[PDB]
């Protein structure tokens, strides 16, 4: 797969959600989508709009929540 | 820069154009250059290097 190894900075994320995800210590898109809705929503200063826009960019990049990973990284 | 125009402009003249401090325009240019530095756009450009 050539799309899972791209850095999470490619997602064009705002600063607040970027800081929240850095606190979650996520740097790969597969690691970004390994978790779920509530698990990422529990983080402080991250609202429904942040994860909503994350899902929007994932859908615009041909991804949809509910997948799983195998042998990564 | 001098892109598709006659002359380039120092940031003071652009600040007069946009009714804003020379500093703010420096910030805008730095932010835009940072944005274009990002991948998914730098590949086609850096193929010219």
Burial class (CB in 10 A: 0-12, 13-18, 19+), A29: buried
Number of Cβ pairs closer than 8 Å across A and B? 7
Q: Which residues of B touch A9 (CB under 8 A)?
A: 38-39
Burial class (CB in 10 A: 0-12, 13-18, 19+), B49: exposed
Q: Please report the residues numbered 9 through 68 in chain A whose beta carbons come closer than 8 angstroms to any beta carbon of chain B.
A: 9-10
Alpha-carbon distances of B27 from A73, B1, B17, rounded to whole Å: 37, 15, 16
Resolution of the model in angstroms: 3.2
CA distance B8 to B26: 15
CA distance A53 to A13: 8
Q: Which residues of B touch A10 (CB under 8 A)?
A: 38-40
Q: Is B43 annotated as a binding residue?
A: yes
Method: cryo-EM
Q: What six digits make up the tokens of A19? A: 């800081």
Complete DSSP assignment for chain B: --TTSS----HHHHHHHHTS-HHHHHHHHHHHHHHHHSTTTHHHHHTT-
Q: Is B46 annotated as a binding residue?
A: yes
Alpha-carbon distances of B49 from A25, A39, B2, B9, B45, rounded to whole Å: 34, 43, 21, 26, 8
- Provide the shortest C-alpha distance from residue B11 to chain A (in Å): 27
Name residues whose C-beta falls within 8 Å of residue A61's C-beta, 6 or more positions apart in sequence: A3, A11
CA distance B6 to B22: 21
């Amino acid at each position: 797969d050539p799309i899972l190894l791209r850095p999470v900075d490619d997602l064009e994320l705002t600063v607040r959600s970027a800081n929240c995800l850095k606190a979650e210590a996520i740097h790969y898109i597969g690691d970004l989508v390994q978790r779920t809705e509530v698990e990422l929503l529990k983080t402080p200063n991250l609202g429904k709009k942040s994860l909503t826009e994350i899902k929007d960019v994932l859908a615009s990049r041909g991804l949809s929540l509910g997948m799983r990973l195998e042998n990564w990284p | 820069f001098g892109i598709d125009m006659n002359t380039d402009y120092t940031l003071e003249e652009v600040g007069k154009q946009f009714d804003v401090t020379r500093e703010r325009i420096r910030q805008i240019e730095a932010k835009a250059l940072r944005k274009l530095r990002h991948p998914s756009r730098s590949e086609v450009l850096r193929s010219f290097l």
